[PDB]
């Protein structure tokens, strides 16, 4: 028998740390934009072992872990540094609901960092998956038995010793320490929900929903396994009302009417229901639930400047940088309320945008951005150094999958390919590649072209400067809008709410909260009064929360304290947005 699962004291206590279930953490449906009613959650307590990187499956699993918290986190019950010479092993038993008999059974991973191999009852489930940020799945039907089944998963993660997308993760001792700069605790292993679902053999795997409100319609591509011969019916509705329906070919874009469309904006993030059913004659072969927000983003010339226009009109995008780090969970928010909380705080503070920094969150995060009403800029996580040939192939493969997995999100409006020259290559080529693959979103070839040895490809939709404290004097070109992809960086160490007391650093330390409030509001007023009229179209304030020893959050890292006057910030943001329109 393994050592019984042991909770670990967390470095900091968030509002949610003490409410994480033991056996059923993160119970919510993991994929809200592609739903079926039947599923089973495999989160909870698994058997666990750490071997050397090249070891096969151990004979004994000596410990237990709580999935889906990485081994470095306190919430896992392990809380240990994982190096490139290690490999994580997970094992649990599970049963399949008997009412799924006669369907395929899919085993779904939201994310696992970095290289994941899966066995069901001792048989390999499919190809090894490499990539820490993209969801993946295996059809495990033929490997199952009718009673208890065993699932074994190995996960290797080299973090920065590898050539893969890593973001802020570095191999570090897990206890709070002085220093560390802008780089943080590593995340190794399964860090999003693991689950099962039944499907027909012929089933939908992907739904691409692309709003075309100027033509009062929704463009849709239905995609999947074994359904390429088929038509599909797609229906748009709200409550009990059918707004529109059309039948068209699987695998080829067609349109569904959406008359008199109620547009999605941050102010009114209206979501229509969507249902898609591949057909054989008149017979439904599968059926998935979804949703859309009817919105567009593009560039246009407005009042003499290139601007980003939402639903054909310019609105200034005032956002924060959000690194998605947790003191208790590292890469995994403790509860769904915790995950949503950071976005709710954006709304409370009057921001209409968020830049998710060199990390891709689970689908539920996109759901909450879609539902709460925030524009999202999505960074592709960076490599730590110049990639060689195989590393380029791998990074591009991961990026393609991340793009393909987020086509339908109304919140997501902009891809940030690269950041401050980190692992940079092929700047212009990649901007063209991403834009051609997802042309209804904006693309930023390189964030921070003014700094850090970063090389500007010259193309994409935005010229993006990082200016601290800022806001600087960026101006648009004839072809590209101007954005401030990072500014601010105002620090304040909150006594009782420091990851490491006295460790905190920032771009400009504030003596007290009154100073912080006055300084922050001054930056927004500067953007409103001077920069936005001269062609600045968006700004990204560093940052929503302190992270480790970077104490430049609007909130503390434990989310227990809001450092700013909410009403004053909200008023300033609202004035900026209103002026811009
Ligand atoms: Mg990792």
């Amino acid at each position: 028998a393994p050592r019984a699962w042991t909770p670990k004291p967390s470095p900091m206590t968030t509002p949610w740390t003490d409410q994480v279930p033991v056996d059923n953490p993160l119970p919510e449906y993991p994929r809200p934009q592609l739903t079926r009613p039947d599923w089973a959650n495999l989160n909870g307590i698994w058997d666990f072992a750490v071997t050397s990187a090249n070891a096969g499956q151990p004979a004994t699993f000596p410990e237990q872990i709580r999935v889906p918290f990485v081994a470095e986190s306190a919430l896992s019950g392990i809380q240990r540094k994982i190096t490139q010479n290690d490999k994580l092993w997970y094992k649990r038993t599970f049963t399949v609901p008997s009412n799924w008999n006669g369907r395929r059974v899919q085993l779904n991973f939201g994310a696992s960092d970095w290289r994941t191999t899966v066995w069901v009852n001792g048989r390999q489930a499919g190809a090894v998956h490499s990539g820490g940020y993209d969801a993946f799945s295996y059809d495990v039907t033929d490997l199952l038995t009718a009673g208890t089944n065993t699932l074994v998963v190995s996960v290797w993660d080299p973090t920065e010793t590898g050539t893969q997308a890593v973001g802020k993760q570095r191999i570090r001792d897990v206890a709070p320490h002085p220093g560390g700069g802008i780089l943080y605790t590593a995340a190794s292993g399964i860090w999003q929900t693991v689950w099962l679902e039944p499907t027909a053999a012929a089933h939908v795997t992907r739904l691409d929903l692309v709003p075309d409100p100027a033509n009062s319609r929704l463009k849709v591509t239905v995609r999947g396994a074994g359904i390429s011969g088929h038509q599909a019916r797609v229906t748009v509705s709200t409550g009990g009302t059918t707004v529109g329906t059309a039948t068209g070919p699987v695998g080829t874009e067609f349109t569904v009417p959406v008359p008199n469309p109620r547009l999605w904006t941050p102010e009114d993030p209206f979501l229509y229901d969507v249902r898609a059913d591949p057909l054989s004659g008149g017979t439904t072969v599968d059926s998935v639930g979804s949703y859309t927000g009817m919105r567009t983003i593009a560039l246009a010339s407005v009042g003499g400047h290139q601007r980003p226009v939402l639903n054909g009109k310019f609105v200034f995008q005032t956002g924060t940088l959000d690194q998605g780090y947790w003191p208790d969970g590292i890469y995994t928010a403790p509860t769904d309320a915790a995950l949503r909380h950071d976005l709710q705080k954006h709304k409370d503070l009057g921001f209409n945008m968020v830049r998710k920094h060199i990390k891709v969150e689970p689908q539920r995060w996109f759901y909450w951005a879609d539902r709460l009403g925030l524009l999202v800029w999505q960074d592709m996580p960076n490599m730590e150094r110049t990639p060689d040939a195989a590393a380029r192939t791998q990074w591009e493969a991961e990026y393609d999958r991340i793009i393909d997995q987020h086509r339908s999100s109304p919140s997501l409006v902009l891809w940030v390919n690269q950041n401050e020259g980190w692992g940079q290559y092929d700047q212009a080529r990649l901007a063209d590649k991403v834009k051609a693959y997802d042309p209804t979103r904006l693309v930023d070839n390189m964030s921070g072209v003014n700094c850090c040895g970063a090389v500007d490809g010259g193309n994409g939709d935005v010229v993006d400067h990082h200016v601290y404290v800022g806001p600087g004097t960026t101006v648009p070109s004839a072809t590209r809008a101007a954005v401030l992809g990072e500014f601010g960086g105002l620090g304040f160490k909150v006594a009782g709410h420091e990851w490491y007391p006295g460790g905190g650093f920032s771009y400009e330390d504030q003596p007290d909260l009154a100073h912080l409030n006055n300084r922050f509001v001054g930056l927004i007023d500067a953007i409103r009064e001077v920069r936005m009229p001269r062609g600045l179209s968006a700004s990204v304030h560093t940052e929503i929360t302190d992270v480790e020893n970077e104490v430049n959050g609007l909130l503390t890292y434990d989310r227990q304290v809001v450092k700013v006057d909410e009403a004053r910030v909200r008023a300033a943001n609202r004035a900026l947005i209103d002026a811009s329109r």
Side-chain angles (χ1 to χ4, degrees):
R3 188 166 203 252
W5 184 80
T6 72
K8 291 284 161 152
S10 179
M12 303 183 86
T13 299
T14 82
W16 308 279
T17 300
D18 300 345
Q19 295 175 105
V20 177
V22 176
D23 293 305
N24 300 109
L26 293 177
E28 299 78 10
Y29 198 75
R31 192 186 60 209
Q33 207 171 25
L34 190 81
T35 69
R36 302 186 182 76
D38 294 307
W39 75 288
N41 197 323
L42 292 176
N43 291 351
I45 306 306
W46 302 40
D47 302 338
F48 183 72
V50 184
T51 71
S52 73
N54 293 127
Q57 179 180 323
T60 303
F61 282 66
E63 293 181 298
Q64 295 193 308
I65 191 166
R66 184 157 63 189
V67 163
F69 299 100
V70 300
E72 296 89 345
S73 74
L75 288 178
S76 69
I78 292 290
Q79 202 191 17
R80 283 202 307 261
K81 176 182 71 180
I82 303 306
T83 80
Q84 74 277 25
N85 297 316
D86 300 323
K87 188 160 64 180
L88 308 184
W89 294 87
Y90 296 88
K91 182 176 71 175
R92 63 162 289 176
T93 60
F94 67 95
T95 58
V96 174
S98 52
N99 62 297
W100 299 9
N101 181 64
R103 274 179 286 175
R104 309 250 19 141
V105 180
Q106 313 295 347
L107 172 60
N108 295 326
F109 294 86
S112 179
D113 200 18
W114 180 70
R115 174 174 276 172
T116 302
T117 318
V118 178
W119 294 262
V120 174
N121 301 313
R123 296 186 218 95
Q124 194 170 313
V128 172
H129 180 268
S130 303
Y133 297 100
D134 65 292
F136 54 105
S137 66
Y138 300 101
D139 175 332
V140 295
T141 310
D142 309 336
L143 312 179
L144 296 172
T145 172
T148 311
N149 294 261
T150 302
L151 177 57
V152 176
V153 180
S154 75
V155 191
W156 175 76
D157 190 345
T159 320
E160 79 277 14
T161 70
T163 56
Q164 84 294 345
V166 281
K168 292 303 203 66
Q169 300 180 64
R170 295 294 184 286
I171 293 162
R172 295 283 178 80
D173 288 302
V174 294
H177 59 73
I182 69 165
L183 301 172
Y184 315 127
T185 304
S188 307
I190 299 168
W191 68 273
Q192 301 186 16
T193 294
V194 182
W195 56 292
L196 301 164
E197 64 179 324
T199 73
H203 66 279
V204 178
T205 60
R206 178 174 138 199
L207 249 199
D208 306 338
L209 303 180
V210 173
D212 190 17
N215 290 314
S216 298
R217 67 195 184 175
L218 177 66
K219 298 169 164 172
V220 53
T221 311
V222 182
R223 307 178 180 275
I227 51 167
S228 60
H230 302 35
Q231 298 295 102
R233 175 159 41 247
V234 178
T235 300
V236 175
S237 57
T238 181
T241 310
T242 305
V243 173
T245 185
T247 290
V250 169
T252 299
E253 189 175 75
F254 63 96
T255 68
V256 179
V258 180
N260 301 310
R262 181 168 170 185
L263 301 179
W264 183 104
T265 60
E267 309 72 37
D268 183 23
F270 187 78
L271 307 169
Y272 289 89
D273 299 318
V274 176
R275 176 150 297 277
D277 295 353
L279 300 169
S280 175
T283 299
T284 286
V285 150
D286 182 38
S287 186
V288 298
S290 196
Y291 63 81
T292 186
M294 294 288 295
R295 66 90 189 105
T296 61
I297 192 76
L299 286 188
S301 180
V302 179
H305 300 290
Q306 289 294 299
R307 300 289 193 177
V309 295
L310 176 69
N311 308 334
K313 304 222 151 209
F314 174 50
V315 57
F316 187 93
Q317 303 182 24
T318 172
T320 85
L321 195 75
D322 187 325
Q323 307 202 74
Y325 257 80
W326 290 85
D328 48 359
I330 311 302
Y331 249 29
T332 307
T335 71
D336 197 48
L339 184 69
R340 176 181 62 197
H341 166 89
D342 302 340
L343 296 179
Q344 182 61 53
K345 295 313 297 173
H346 282 73
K347 300 292 303 185
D348 293 344
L349 292 175
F351 290 102
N352 62 352
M353 181 261 289
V354 58
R355 177 183 174 205
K356 180 64 52 167
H357 191 40
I358 56 187
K359 186 197 186 195
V360 186
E361 298 283 13
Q363 286 293 350
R364 287 191 71 76
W365 184 89
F366 286 87
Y367 167 79
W368 284 117
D370 295 343
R371 187 164 160 169
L372 297 175
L374 296 165
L375 302 163
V376 168
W377 300 8
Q378 178 64 61
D379 290 0
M380 172 64 205
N382 64 287
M383 292 169 282
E384 183 259 7
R385 61 188 177 282
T386 309
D388 68 1
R392 289 170 198 219
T393 299
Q394 172 63 30
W395 187 84
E396 292 182 42
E398 292 184 38
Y399 199 3
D400 286 341
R401 291 179 58 86
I402 292 155
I403 298 164
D404 286 332
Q405 292 179 5
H406 297 84
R407 288 176 175 286
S408 298
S409 167
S411 56
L412 174 63
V413 294
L414 184 155
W415 294 104
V416 184
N417 285 1
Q418 302 185 79
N419 180 71
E420 286 194 1
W422 300 348
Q424 62 180 338
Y425 77 109
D426 287 12
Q427 292 81 349
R429 164 186 167 264
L430 290 168
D432 286 335
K433 179 183 185 204
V434 169
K435 188 71 176 187
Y437 203 48
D438 194 13
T440 66
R441 272 47 184 278
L442 303 179
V443 185
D444 174 4
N445 89 97
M446 174 68 67
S447 194
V449 294
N450 59 312
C451 68
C452 316
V455 165
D456 186 0
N459 63 344
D461 295 314
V462 297
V463 53
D464 176 339
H465 286 188
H466 289 181
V467 187
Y468 290 94
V469 169
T473 55
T474 317
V475 291
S477 70
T479 55
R480 298 190 301 180
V483 305
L484 182 56
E486 280 173 42
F487 77 103
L490 306 181
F492 186 70
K493 299 181 304 297
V494 176
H497 302 280
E498 301 174 80
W499 186 73
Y500 189 83
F505 67 87
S506 76
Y507 294 85
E508 182 182 287
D509 187 43
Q510 306 299 304
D512 59 39
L513 295 186
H515 287 61
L516 172 71
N517 280 314
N518 285 337
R519 184 70 166 109
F520 189 59
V521 169
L523 285 166
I524 302 307
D525 286 333
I527 294 168
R528 177 178 46 77
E529 293 208 1
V530 177
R531 297 315 311 157
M532 179 268 295
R534 289 177 180 70
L536 191 63
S537 291
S539 60
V540 178
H541 175 74
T542 301
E543 54 175 318
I544 190 66
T545 79
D546 298 342
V547 178
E548 291 193 6
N549 284 320
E550 185 165 11
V551 294
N552 53 15
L554 300 190
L555 313 218
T556 55
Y557 191 27
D558 65 2
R559 286 57 174 189
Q560 292 286 1
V561 171
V562 178
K563 304 187 199 179
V564 289
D565 185 315
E566 294 199 10
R568 291 173 51 198
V569 172
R570 179 171 55 242
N573 271 323
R574 274 209 220 308
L576 168 51
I577 292 166
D578 287 336
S580 75
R581 291 197 296 231

